[PDB]
Amino acid sequence: NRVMLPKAAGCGSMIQRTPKIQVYSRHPAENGKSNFLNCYVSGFHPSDIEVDLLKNGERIEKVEHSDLSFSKDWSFYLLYYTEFTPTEKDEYACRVNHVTLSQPKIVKWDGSGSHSMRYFYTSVSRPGRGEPRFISVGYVDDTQFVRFDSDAASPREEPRAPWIEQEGPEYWDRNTQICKTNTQTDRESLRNLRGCYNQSEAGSHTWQTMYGCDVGPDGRLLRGHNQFAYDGKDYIALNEDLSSWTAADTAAQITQRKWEAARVAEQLRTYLEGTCVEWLRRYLENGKETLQRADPPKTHVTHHPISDHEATLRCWALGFYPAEITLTWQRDGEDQTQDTELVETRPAGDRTFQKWAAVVVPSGEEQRYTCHVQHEGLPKPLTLRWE
């Protein structure tokens, strides 16, 4: 359940991040069995992006995508997907265009007891094209359960998980109202922030908000969060004591003084210690058969010679939930952090996640390397060695 957010105060630099692209199937592809083709685009900023799935060079028409969300560094991620039945010869790919790319990039298809709730908000101004685009999503751990999009035909808080559908009309009305109010608050924040940095109305800017709570196995608050970012950079954050702010620059300090006088932190603390933890506890009980079940990774190692004297060892983890995982390659038990290539953890589309880690080793020394896997679904870490 949401909270109404404060407005940045009236009184420049901008991050650009290039998308990371992975193309893959949800489950091992079968030459005659239905599957899902996934294109996962992550780590990018700003949020404007174009993603198409290709079949034999042709653009696939019925492609869905996940609701815009972002990672701790404020960078965005999206999953694009479609059901498909792969064949021996049909060739699939993903094409991505973004301001950081000089041409569209084509990639060919080759527990613990602790929990969290987060709401993520993204407002993006659209100069000359109407009002800002407002998109908000809510998560329990790595399970999305609501979304709100100001460009929907009838914008409202919408269910995205089965265990939230039982909430009554008061819940949907209340959270829809909070979203609609926050849309207008964000529009006012964007206007105020332009003034703080002497920016005209002609440029597009991004205002992102996150808040939420972490609880332990007994349901107690472990810590609360509320942070804001402008154009991809930290702007102001509630400190861990839930009683003070950290402001990134002189503009944000003006907001800090306004929110101090308005006792914003006290209101957020009240929400984080009460409503946030109480509703998270409710969701964990109502969705316990999925939310309180950890799925351990299914793991294996592959081996690819790259020359007469070196080979690639790749450690795969598949089908795990929640998304947090650690894959490490060791030589004689010592971490090879510098030499290990990792990919961003990616969604299969069915709640679970996937990840791999690779290392290049001298041919003949493969047996001195082990892959170490840590996941909360494992009683103890797993170790794998190539045969």
Residue numbers in the entry: 323 to 333, 999 to 1097, 1999 to 2275
Give verbatim excerpts from the published study on this entry.
HLA class I molecules consist of an allele-specific heavy chain that is associated noncovalently with β2-microglobulin (β2m) and a presented peptide. Upon identifying a peptide that binds to both HLA-B∗39:06 and B∗39:01, we determined the respective X-ray structures of the two allotypes presenting this peptide to 1.7 Å resolution.
Thus, to obtain the protein in quantities suitable for X-ray crystallography, HLA-B∗39:06 was produced in mammalian cells as a secreted single-chain peptide-MHC (sc-pMHC) in which the NRVMLPKAA peptide, human β2m, and the extracellular domain of the HLA-B∗39:06 heavy chain were joined with flexible linkers. To enhance protein stability, a substitution was made at position 84 of the MHC heavy chain (Y84C), which leads to the formation of a disulfide bond between Cys84 and an additional cysteine introduced at the second position of the linker connecting the peptide and β2m. However, in our structure, Ala8 of NRVMLPKAA, and not Ala9, occupies the F pocket and forms polar and van der Waals contacts with F-pocket residues Ser77, Asn80, Trp95, Thr143, and Trp147, while Ala9 is solvent-exposed. Superposition of H2-Kb and HLA-B∗39:06 underscores the 8-mer peptides OVA-8 and VSV-8 overlay with the first eight amino acids of the NRVMLPKAA peptide with RMSDs of 0.95 Å and 0.84 Å, respectively, over the eight aligned Cα atoms. Additionally, our HLA-B∗39:06 structure suggests that for 8-mer peptides presented by this HLA-B allotype, the residues that are solvent-exposed and likely available to participate in interactions with a cognate T cell receptor (TCR) are at positions four and seven (Met4 and Lys7). Consistent with this behavior, we found that Val3 of the peptide forms van der Waals contacts with multiple residues of the MHC heavy chain, in addition to a hydrogen bond with Tyr99.
